[PDB]
């Protein structure tokens, strides 16, 4: 399957992780990476975190040194590829040949149709450019409206509050983090943000805006100096769609990263792939997926005897005093709570079970427990539920014993 030369479209974390693994696995042929951003490859999670404090992009760059002998074509957009001719057409007029093409083009923020012709600042937060523009607007005592109660919106909320910015947040759902969070976590997170002064508006949508005021579907108004929209992302799958690959807001791939087009692979945010815990296809939107899927696909390309991608999903979110870690499924048929759920010195763990089997876990300010829980999750452990609830139980011991 691994035919030289290798061409990768996109230069984010999935791409970097993939090319480093190709080299480490022993592939020595040509590798060329096309990245549309004119930026040394960088990690995105800092952008709604410490980057908002220090503004230093040289703290967030990805290490490409495990990827030697790679030509990175930065500031260049892949415009199309021809899977018969095995070529990629570039915005600078050049063409690249490929033996193996890898689509690692990520996802872009959804726009808000109702703010389409707005006459006040409206941003999304995906890129370094976005983060710099938003950060420049976090003036103390200014008003920020965040649209969407996803993790990135909430990370920005905590960041802005730290900066002395007044924060309102509007969410269409009755809860925060509706996408991949246990309700117990979501409820607590709302309490935390409210206590930090975030003005939360649930079950509201943006209907428009007039002369610096944002309008909502309950017939009300929110004044803001800046709006940041964070209502989710859409896969950057246009090249795949045009070339005849199977796509539906994401490129369908199997556990080997194969698309429906021979010699074309995809990885990271752009893919729609099997979640082994739910057994359903999903577009996973996580840092860990980008890295882990990139590595697994590279490893199997170099060594076809290697297993396909098999890691179970997890993410982290850093929201002010809350260091949140979530693995697996948001719910099963049972939740076990370890510790008190309290705003005082927040520290707790949730475990989700399905007929006795661990299917998900959450740690808030409890990193020590998260590793053992992910191990228990990976093997589908069925531990004694009394022991799981018992504060006397050491989860690392439990994980090591299985």
What does the binding site for its own copies look like in residue numbers (CB under 8 A)? 244-248, 252-256, 258-262, 273-274, 279-281, 308
Q: Does 77 bind ligand FAD (CB under 6 A)?
A: yes
Write phi, then psi, for 388 (nearest 5 degrees): -60, -35
Alpha-carbon distance 185 to 192, whole Å?
10
> Coil, helix or strand for 98?
coil
In whole angstroms, the minimum distance from the beta carbon of 280 to its own copies comes to: 6
Binds 244, which of its own copies, ligand FAD, none (CB < 5 to 8 A, cut-off by type)? Answer: its own copies
Q: Is the peptide bond preceding residue 271 cis, with omega within 30 degrees of 0?
A: no
Quote the crossing angle between the two packed helices 151-162 and 183-195, to the nearest 10°.
20
Q: Does 21 bind ligand FAD (CB under 6 A)?
A: no
| 259 versus 362: smaller Cβ distance to its own copies | 259
| 116 versus 342: smaller Cβ distance to its own copies | 116
Cα Rg of the chain (Å, integer): 22
Binds 260, which of its own copies, ligand FAD, none (CB < 5 to 8 A, cut-off by type)? Answer: its own copies
Alpha-carbon distance 144 to 9, whole Å?
35
Residue that is written with structure tokens 């707005």 in the block: 118
Q: Does 257 bind ligand FAD (CB under 6 A)?
A: no
User: Considering only 33-41, 111-119, 333-341, 351-359, which stretch makes contact with ligand FAD by CB under 6 A?
Assistant: 33-41
Q: Does 35 bind ligand FAD (CB under 6 A)?
A: yes
Candidates 36, 171, 237, 369; binder of ligand FAD (CB under 6 A) is 36
Q: Does 350 bind ligand FAD (CB under 6 A)?
A: no
Give Cα separations from 187 to 159, 359, 399 (angstroms).
20, 20, 29
| 314 versus 353: smaller Cβ distance to ligand FAD | 314
Q: Does 268 bind ligand FAD (CB under 6 A)?
A: yes
Q: Does 88 bind ligand FAD (CB under 6 A)?
A: no
| 209 versus 293: smaller Cβ distance to ligand FAD | 293
Quote the crossing angle between the two packed helices 13-25 and 287-302, to the nearest 10°.
30
Candidates 123, 126, 179, 396; binder of ligand FAD (CB under 6 A) is 126
Pure H helices in 138-286 = 151-162, 183-195, 238-243
Binds 254, which of its own copies, ligand FAD, none (CB < 5 to 8 A, cut-off by type)? Answer: its own copies
> Coil, helix or strand for 361?
strand
| 281 versus 316: smaller Cβ distance to its own copies | 281
Candidates 48, 100, 168, 319; binder of ligand FAD (CB under 6 A) is 48
Half-sphere exposure of 65 (CA within 13 A, CB side): 2
Binds 245, which of ligand FAD, its own copies, none (CB < 5 to 8 A, cut-off by type)? Answer: its own copies
Q: Does 105 bind ligand FAD (CB under 6 A)?
A: yes
For the chain, give the longest Cα–Cα distance.
65
Q: Does 160 bind ligand FAD (CB under 6 A)?
A: no
- Tell which residue, 30, 6, 1, has the closest CA to residue 98: 6
In whole angstroms, the minimum distance from the beta carbon of 21 to ligand FAD comes to: 14
Given a contact cutoff of 8 angstroms between Cβ atoms, the answer to whether 219 and 237 are in contact is no
Candidates 315, 322, 361, 378; binder of ligand FAD (CB under 6 A) is 315
Burial (CB count <10 Å: 0-12, 13-18, 19+), residue 44: buried
Q: Does 317 bind ligand FAD (CB under 6 A)?
A: yes
Q: Copy the structure tokens of residue 231.
A: 């209502």
Binds 75, which of ligand FAD, its own copies, none (CB < 5 to 8 A, cut-off by type)? Answer: none
In whole angstroms, the minimum distance from the beta carbon of 12 to its own copies comes to: 22
Give Cα separations from 256 to 227, 271, 294, 392, 394 (angstroms).
40, 12, 10, 42, 36
- 165-176 burial string, b = 16+ CB within 10 Å, else e? bbbbbbbbeebb
| 199 versus 254: smaller Cβ distance to its own copies | 254
Binds 9, which of its own copies, ligand FAD, none (CB < 5 to 8 A, cut-off by type)? Answer: ligand FAD
Binding site for ligand FAD (CB under 6 A): 9-15, 34-37, 44-45, 47-48, 77-78, 104-107, 125-126, 152, 236, 239, 268-269, 285-288, 290, 315-317
């Amino acid at each position: 399957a691994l035919k030289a030369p290798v061409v990768v479209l996109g230069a984010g974390l999935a791409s970097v992780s993939f090319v480093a693994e190709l080299r480490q696995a022993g592939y020595q042929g040509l590798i060329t990476v096309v990245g549309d951003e004119a930026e040394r490859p960088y990690d995105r999670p800092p952008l709604s975190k410490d980057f908002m404090a220090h503004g230093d992009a040289e703290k967030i760059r990805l290490d490409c040194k495990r990827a030697p002998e790679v030509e990175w074509l930065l500031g260049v957009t892949a415009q199309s590829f021809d899977p018969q001719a095995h070529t990629v057409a570039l915005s600078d007029g050049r063409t690249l040949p490929y033996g193996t093409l890898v689509l690692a083009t990520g996802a872009a923020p959804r726009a808000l149709p109702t703010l389409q012709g707005a006459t006040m600042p409206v941003h999304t937060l995906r890129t370094l450019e976005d983060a710099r523009r938003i950060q420049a607007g976090l003036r103390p005592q200014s008003r920020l409206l965040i649209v969407g109660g996803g993790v990135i919106g909430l990370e920005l909320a905590a960041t802005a509050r730290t900066a002395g910015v007044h924060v309102s947040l509007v969410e269409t759902q009755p809860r925060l983090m509706s996408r991949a969070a246990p309700a117990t976590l979501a409820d607590f997170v709302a309490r935390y943000h409210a206590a930090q002064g975030v003005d939360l508006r649930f079950e509201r949508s943006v209907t428009g805006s007039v002369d610096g005021v944002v309008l909502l579907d309950d017939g009300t108004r929110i004044a803001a100096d800046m709006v940041v929209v964070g209502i989710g992302v859409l896969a950057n799958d246009a090249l795949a769609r045009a070339a005849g690959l199977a796509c539906d807001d994401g490129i369908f791939v199997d556990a080997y990263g194969r698309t429906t087009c021979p010699d074309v692979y995809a990885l990271g945010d752009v893919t729609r792939q099997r979640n082994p815990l739910s057994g359903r296809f999903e577009r996973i939107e996580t840092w860990s997926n980008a890295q882990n899927q990139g590595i697994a696909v590279a490893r199997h390309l170099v060594d076809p005897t290697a297993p396909g991608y098999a890691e179970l999903p997890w993410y982290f979110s850093d929201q002010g005093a809350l260091r949140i870690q979530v693995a697996g499924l948001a719910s099963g048929d049972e939740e076990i709570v370890r510790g008190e759920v309290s705003l005082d010195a927040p520290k707790f763990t949730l475990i989700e079970l399905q007929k006795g089997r661990i299917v998900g876990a959450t740690c808030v300010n409890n990193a020590r427990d998260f590793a053992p829980l992910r191990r228990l999750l990976a093997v589908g452990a069925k531990p004694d539920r009394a022991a799981l609830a018992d504060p006397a139980t050491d989860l690392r011991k439990l994980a090591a014993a299985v």
